[PDB]
Amino acid sequence: GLGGQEEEEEQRWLDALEKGELDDNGDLKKEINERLLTARQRALLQKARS
Amino acid sequence: SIDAPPSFKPAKKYSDVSGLLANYTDPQSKLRFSTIEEFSYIRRLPSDVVTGYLALRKATSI
Amino acid sequence: DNIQGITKPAIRRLARRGGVKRISGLIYEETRGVLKVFLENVIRDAVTYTEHAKRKTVTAMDVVYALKRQGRTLYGFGG
Amino acid sequence: VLRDNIQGITKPAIRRLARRGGVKRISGLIYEETRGVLKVFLENVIRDAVTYTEHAKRKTVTAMDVVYALKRQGRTLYGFGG
Amino acid sequence: KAKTRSSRAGLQFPVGRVHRLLRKGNYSERVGAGAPVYLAAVLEYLTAEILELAGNAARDNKKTRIIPRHLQLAIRNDEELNKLLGRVTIAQGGVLPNIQAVLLPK
Amino acid sequence: GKARAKAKTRSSRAGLQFPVGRVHRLLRKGNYSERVGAGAPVYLAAVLEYLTAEILELAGNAARDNKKTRIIPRHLQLAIRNDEELNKLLGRVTIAQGGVLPNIQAVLLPK
Amino acid sequence: KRSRKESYSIYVYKVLKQVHPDTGISSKAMGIMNSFVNDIFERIAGEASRLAHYNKRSTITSREIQTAVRLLLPGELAKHAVSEGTKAVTKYTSSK
Amino acid sequence: RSRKESYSIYVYKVLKQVHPDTGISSKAMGIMNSFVNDIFERIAGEASRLAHYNKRSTITSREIQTAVRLLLPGELAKHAVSEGTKAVTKYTS
Amino acid sequence: KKPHRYRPGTVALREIRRYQKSTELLIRKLPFQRLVREIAQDFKTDLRFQSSAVMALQEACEAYLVGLFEDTNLCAIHAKRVTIMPKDIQLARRIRGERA
Amino acid sequence: PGTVALREIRRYQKSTELLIRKLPFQRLVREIAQDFKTDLRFQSSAVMALQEACEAYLVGLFEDTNLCAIHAKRVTIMPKDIQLARRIRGERA
Amino acid sequence: ETEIIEGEVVEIQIDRSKVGKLTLKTTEMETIYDLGTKMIESLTKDKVQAGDVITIDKAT
Questions:
Q1: Which residues of D touch F100 (CB under 8 A)?
Q2: H or E element that contains I77
Q3: Is chain K in touch with chain C: ≥3 Cβ pairs within 8 A?
Q4: Which of B12, F20, G35, J71 could form an SS bridge with F11, CB 3.0 to 4.6 Å?
Q5: Which residues carry this modification: N6,N6,N6-trimethyllysine (chain G)?
Q6: Which residue of H has its CA nearest to F13?
Q7: What does CATH list as the number for E2-106?
Q8: φ, ψ of residue C8 in degrees (nearest 5)
Q9: In this structure, which topology does domain D1-80 adopt according to CATH?
Q10: CA H42: distance to chain centroid?
């Protein structure tokens, strides 16, 4: 029913549990977005990427 | 200077729970008791009245 | 009876939030023992705070202070 | 001079610390990771001691600045004072 | 005419309340007037820092209102918040979506 | 006039050995509260004195059993780690140059 | 009759709206934050009390709080907090 | 010139009270000084927090007695309360 | 839906993905809300509870049990089990300083 | 083999001395510190207080690791065990 | 008519004249006594120890 708006990612996450395509802690693999990052996370990455 | 002296003979042990003469004092509650049914009674008292009876004789609790 | 109020499926639910795949049949009652001694250690400190405060309803503050002292703190109960 | 002087932690010292901890056999994989784990502990204790020293404007670290680091890290020490 | 210390510091948080607490919290006999400015700015910053992650967590988890889940998500993903909040727990906060990979079916 | 010569200490009036006046001095200058009770430092001194008596008695037993009578950090560590009550009071602390309590695991012992 | 009860409510709500204007917050989440704000204040000011004793000082002071926050905060969270505390002191000391 | 404010003579007097044959190395005196100072900071810190939670200006014998009741373990707490109440009992006369 | 009856010891993962996601408290309120009173009354009889205090206890205690179980998961995985067994809890509770 | 290792355990648990050499550890302290600040000085006792805390931390780590290894029945120890001990005591993740 | 004490001695302590304190038990009650000198010089003389059962003619 209408619960598909919250169930579909779990339905995909079970399909990926069969396929074994999960990430290093068992999530569905996803695009990283740097617009979500704080100035401190940007600084931690700046200090790592050298 | 009118306060009377401290007593010259030692104080009797009257039992705390009944006033009858106390041949005994309990290692746990430190009260004075006279009979076996008084020992059976004092081990059923709450700590509050035990320290109450002790304080009533300026003994080892406040 | 009261300690068995930690239900056999509640042990499974809690361990499944804890990520574990499978439970051995002996886990349950000794885990109630662990929950019991943890509850007891926090509740007795909370009562110790409540008695100094003269009150005799155990407050959310009495248990927050016990948990804060024991380094098992929580937020959301007005710390 | 300056160096990676964590290789001043001689292998018999690691064996002795392990033997004082009562572990009987010590694989070749232990030693260099254990040097890392020791260094990581020193880094925090030193970071903190250096900051207690910065309030006092000192260059000279005392046994107190480390005892205070050990207090904030919850691994307190008796005998040096504090 | 009068105005708050917060307005001069550029802070939203009430600097006078912080100075009143720095007295009554038994921390020392005296308190420098810039101490509550610096400390309120740190409190306000730590609050802005965590709630920026909470707002992004709420938005990504498809909700308009921040709840204890979005706080736990903000707290446990950023290791410096997680390491600061190591000895504390969140009212109805749950935990991260994280699975021990050895437990997957093979 | 003038104040009392050889005025009796709070400690010796209480029957204590610890410096009750210093306990009050340190409670007040240590900023723990803006006012401090007169019997508060008596009680505190008596607790510190009791813990001191107990820990030193167990350390002196550890010294006697070790064939010694000068306490060294070893005897205190042996006392503190033999007694479960001191051990669980003293979990977050190291006794400097006291070493560790000697213990072999049952799996490491013979046969 | 009951007294007014102390919480940072409009100030934490203003701190939310200045970074996520679109977003609301629950009374539970506000209670968690108000608890956290008071707890971190107590850690910083409690550690500051020890730093004051370690230096025999009578005054809790921004110069000394700058040591207590870098002791308590892990990693770069210290560096950013020390910067913003310095920016707040910069705005205030420009006017007094 | 400079000072340290140690408990040394009091802990030594207590030693000779419990075990008249026994003595202290200054390294063990360092343990005892560290210990009694730390337990003082623990109890006074607990009592301070407890008084502030109860919105008092004062710590008294009941604040400290409760702070000790929190800090100490099993039988040592029972005996510590016993000596704390005995001392206050024989002081208040 | 589609995996249905797939591999016993894997509806376990269907359970993890329910309880890890959700805000619920997994012990029933009423049994626990009596048990906290029974635990308290041995030390002082005739105690009441604030209706928030029992919830603060439950939420701290369920978090303590959940953290213990996840640490116990590492104890099982370290010993190459996916079944938690009593000795796993004994290791965790000793190393965290709760039993020694 | 393996009998004299038990006699080493007994000997080092009867003794109370520093197990790391003073001069190498004294350099290690300074060599780490020189990028937390320039040119740190150290009081003579400070290096010893550091070394005592570090050796006590390592003995406690090996003690907790011993319980990890013997839980896994293996009498020999590996990083496989230490990475439980740190993760479960709480210094990592 | 004779006054007789009869019990298990639970604990017994003696200081350094002498003063001492003695505890006695039956299957039904427990008691503590401050001893007088002429009991101390009997309990010590007869090497009494905790866990003994003892009967004492109080007049002697």
A1: 20-21
A2: helix I53-78
A3: no
A4: F20
A5: 56
A6: H91
A7: 1.10.20.10
A8: -55, -45
A9: Histone, subunit A (1.10.20)
A10: 10
Among F27, J56, E44, A44, residue whose Cα is nearest residue G19: E44
> For residues D32-63, b (16+ Cβ closer than 10 Å) or e, as one string?
eebbebbbebbeebbbbbbbbbbbbebeebbb
Domain extents in chain J: 9-92
Spacing of C-alpha D45 from chain mean position: 7
Judge whether H62 is closer than 8 Å to chain C, CB to CB: yes
- Domain C1-77 in CATH 3.40.50.2020: no
**Which of I68, D20, B18, I38 lies closest to F102 in space, CA to CA?**
D20
**Which H or E run includes F42?**
helix F40-65
Grouping H, G, I as helix, E, B as strand and the rest as coil, residue H58 is strand
Angle at D20 between CA D14 and CA D21, to 5 degrees: 90
Instruction: Report d(CA G21, CA G16) in Å as an integer.
Output: 7
**Chain I neighbors of E67, CB-CB under 8 A:** 23
Interface touch D81/H34, C-beta < 8 Å = yes
CATH number for I16-99: choose from 1.20.1260.10, 1.10.20.10, 3.40.50.300, 3.10.320.10.
1.10.20.10
SS3 J37: coil
Distance from CA of G15 to the nearest CA of A (A): 15
Helices marked H in C18-59 — which ranges? 27-52
Tally Cβ neighbours within 10 Å of residue F94. 24
Q: How far apart are CA C19 and CA C41, in angstroms?
A: 26
Backbone angles phi, psi at I49, to 5 degrees: -130, 140
Instruction: Find, in chain E, the residue whose alpha carbon is nearest to that of A41.
Output: E78
**What SS3 class is residue D76?**
strand
- Assigned CATH for J9-92: 1.10.20.10
Domain boundaries, chain C: 1-77
- Does domain F7-111 bear CATH number 2.60.130.10? no
Q: Are F45 and H84 in contact (CB under 8 A)?
A: no
Check CB contact of A40 with chain E, cutoff 8 Å: yes
Residue that is written with structure tokens 């610390």 in the block:
D17
> Which resolution, in Å, applies to this structure?
3.5
The reply to whether E86 touches chain I by the CB within 8 Å rule is no
E1 C-beta neighbours (distance < 10 Å), count:
2
Residue of A nearest to E106 (CA): A20
